[PDB]
Design a protein around this motif. Sequence first.
Motif, PDB file in Angstrom:
ATOM      1  N   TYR A 155      -1.620  -4.099  -4.841  1.00  0.00           N
ATOM      2  CA  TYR A 155      -1.074  -2.784  -4.550  1.00  0.00           C
ATOM      3  C   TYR A 155      -2.242  -1.802  -4.444  1.00  0.00           C
ATOM      4  N   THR A 198       0.832  -1.199   0.000  1.00  0.00           N
ATOM      5  CA  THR A 198       0.000   0.000   0.000  1.00  0.00           C
ATOM      6  C   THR A 198       0.865   1.248   0.000  1.00  0.00           C
ATOM      7  N   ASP A 199       0.392   2.306  -0.656  1.00  0.00           N
ATOM      8  CA  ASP A 199       1.087   3.599  -0.639  1.00  0.00           C
ATOM      9  C   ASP A 199       0.616   4.183   0.704  1.00  0.00           C
ATOM     10  N   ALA A 204       3.600   1.242  -9.893  1.00  0.00           N
ATOM     11  CA  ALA A 204       3.277   0.182  -8.944  1.00  0.00           C
ATOM     12  C   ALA A 204       2.147  -0.688  -9.495  1.00  0.00           C
ATOM     13  N   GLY A 251      -3.179   2.266  -4.402  1.00  0.00           N
ATOM     14  CA  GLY A 251      -2.652   3.619  -4.559  1.00  0.00           C
ATOM     15  C   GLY A 251      -3.662   4.751  -4.701  1.00  0.00           C
ATOM     16  N   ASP A 296       1.937   6.266  -8.255  1.00  0.00           N
ATOM     17  CA  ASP A 296       1.622   4.848  -8.115  1.00  0.00           C
ATOM     18  C   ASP A 296       1.430   4.090  -9.432  1.00  0.00           C
ATOM     19  N   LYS A 310       8.487   3.653  -7.737  1.00  0.00           N
ATOM     20  CA  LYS A 310       7.879   2.470  -7.142  1.00  0.00           C
ATOM     21  C   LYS A 310       7.964   1.105  -7.821  1.00  0.00           C
ATOM     22  N   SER A 364      -4.265  -4.372  -8.518  1.00  0.00           N
ATOM     23  CA  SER A 364      -4.153  -3.004  -8.077  1.00  0.00           C
ATOM     24  C   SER A 364      -5.492  -2.381  -7.674  1.00  0.00           C
ATOM     25  N   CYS A 385       8.613  -2.350  -5.938  1.00  0.00           N
ATOM     26  CA  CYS A 385       7.566  -3.380  -5.914  1.00  0.00           C
ATOM     27  C   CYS A 385       8.134  -4.774  -6.146  1.00  0.00           C
ATOM     28  N   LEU A 435       4.720   1.138   0.832  1.00  0.00           N
ATOM     29  CA  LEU A 435       5.563   1.824  -0.124  1.00  0.00           C
ATOM     30  C   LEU A 435       5.213   3.308  -0.083  1.00  0.00           C
ATOM     31  N   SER A 436       6.190   4.148   0.210  1.00  0.00           N
ATOM     32  CA  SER A 436       5.948   5.584   0.215  1.00  0.00           C
ATOM     33  C   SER A 436       7.180   6.346  -0.284  1.00  0.00           C
ATOM     34  N   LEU A 474      10.295   7.563  -4.791  1.00  0.00           N
ATOM     35  CA  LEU A 474       9.183   7.878  -5.682  1.00  0.00           C
ATOM     36  C   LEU A 474       9.216   7.078  -7.012  1.00  0.00           C
TER      37      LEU A 474
END
Lengths: 180, 180, 180, 180
Positions: free
Chosen positions: C104, C13-14, C114, C106, C111, C84, C121, C88, C57-58, C82
Amino acid sequence: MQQKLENIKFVITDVDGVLTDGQLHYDANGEAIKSFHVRDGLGIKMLMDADIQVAVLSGRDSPILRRRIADLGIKLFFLGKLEKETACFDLMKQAGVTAEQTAYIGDDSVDLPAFAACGTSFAVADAPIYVKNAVDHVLSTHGGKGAFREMSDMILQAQGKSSVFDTAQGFLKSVKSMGQ
Amino acid sequence: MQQKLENIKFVITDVDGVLTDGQLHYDANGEAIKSFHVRDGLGIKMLMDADIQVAVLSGRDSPILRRRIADLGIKLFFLGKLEKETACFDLMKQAGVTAEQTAYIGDDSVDLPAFAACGTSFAVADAPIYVKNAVDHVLSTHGGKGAFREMSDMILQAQGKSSVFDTAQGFLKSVKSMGQ
Amino acid sequence: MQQKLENIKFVITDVDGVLTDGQLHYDANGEAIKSFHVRDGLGIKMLMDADIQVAVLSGRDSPILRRRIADLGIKLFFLGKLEKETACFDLMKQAGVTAEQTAYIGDDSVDLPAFAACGTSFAVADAPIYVKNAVDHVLSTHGGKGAFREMSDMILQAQGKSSVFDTAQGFLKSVKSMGQ
Amino acid sequence: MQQKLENIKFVITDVDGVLTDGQLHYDANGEAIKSFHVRDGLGIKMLMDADIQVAVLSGRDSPILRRRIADLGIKLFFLGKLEKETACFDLMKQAGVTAEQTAYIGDDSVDLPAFAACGTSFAVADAPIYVKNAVDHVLSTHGGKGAFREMSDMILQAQGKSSVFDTAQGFLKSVKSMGQ
């Protein structure tokens, strides 16, 4: 409303739930933050600038509220006192205005007595129904989202002073009295 | 359900999700801010002022929350409890009341066993579908927007004690126990 | 989705925009507060408890986020980056899962990469359309209001594991693992 | 707008009510917190990255705001200025552009003179009707909810540069200038 609005020379607003969305932001030490709305402040100034004193009556007190009061230049105010009836007249005497010259904006039961005291009352949008039923006018805006500004805007509306917020020119006029 | 509401001599409330909107405001040190609604505070006191005891049962424990609980004058509670059944029974015992005379307002799965344990159960407006399906009354106010006050209002109303928040006269009369 | 969902073994996850409403709370020194939602926390714990790993993930690294990551007991995460895509893959190799087993969630352009790297997603309800366009499933909950929980409930339900959250007993069985 | 948008080489944005929802989070010392949306943040960067300068004109001045400003890499701004007409012109001179090449986004009366001075003006969705009446375009996103980003996307779009926020590839290509 046009009736009573044009006659207002003194505005008294509760704080928590009106100038605020009612959230008490706590940190380990009690009240840490209080959220006010930038449009409300401009409205407070526009009123003052238009010869309409503004005071806050709050059933609570905090250095935070005091700071905000000072940023806005509010001179008349009563904090920590949960009985609002005699507190309003006490504000009215201090302002040299009568009941018929003072408007009040509230959101909860605690304000029921101030609506009785001021003759011209406002309720924020998220106010409960027993408060809405006890005021003259219910605001479309929620407490803390500009409810006060909605009120100031309409008070200055009815008294022909809207130009101050209506237009670029009217606003630049009172520009030296809009700070906060 | 007016019956249930009339039998209530005890309220047990969850914190995150009910008394707040579910947001956990983190510092590098964990929760740094917890927002509580003034109108929910007033309602907690009015219940107390009305001989209805109030308890807190949060799935999380913080000193911020402990400070809010103390401010409100709440003596019965359990924090950091993810197993709420046992917690609910202990609290009742402490209050000297039955599952029949106690209500519970929750918001998430953690609150499911508290629901089952308590006579009457409430869910905030934003509670998931599986929480709403397991209570007696889904409130219309979202968590943190005054959902507790919506409930305490129902409770007092149903016990003929609404003048406390219904009107200037009634509120003033209990002005002694209306703090936060 | 039912097929992709029952195959999910890993969720990435963002943060800002997903676990939060995208708001960055600044004090004079940069990020001062990060608000996370409790029901999202329970979600993460329920997912991990059901043998579905959760990574974060950030692009923003901050001790506040790290604190949250720790409370949640999230083991795999990449911060400050940034870009991603590779991130991933690295997380997937770390998780021991294939792209077809990973989800994932976002909210912004950042994103997109990602979304492409992960089999499944999700986009939060308030993501911009060019993000909703790039994902398999657009969630109905706003970022930071429990969008992640919406997704996890969805994965758990799809995997015949919805019990931990829709039944008091199901919850009570996985209770020792719900701590956030 | 199309024609207007294609010629924008400079964007001037107000802060309170635009980059934020107008809430002023007070400390006993004044503004304690300012919340800025991450996507507005990215929108500012995509603009700069596309050779479109970004400036800030705010009625208030605070170290919290200045920190956001520096994080976004903004060099042109005027804070604490309630008179925004002149300021807009000054910033225009600083950016080496014309009123036609400059857009402005606002939310309240104080912005009225700014709207008149800039070629293209925007209002956030929650702006007063008397503010909306005065702008070239009313955004659909509330201030603080990503209204700047909504505008930035429109501009870039109109200029054939949407690829940065539109696709993974366009994003990565500029990924080194997206930090905030």
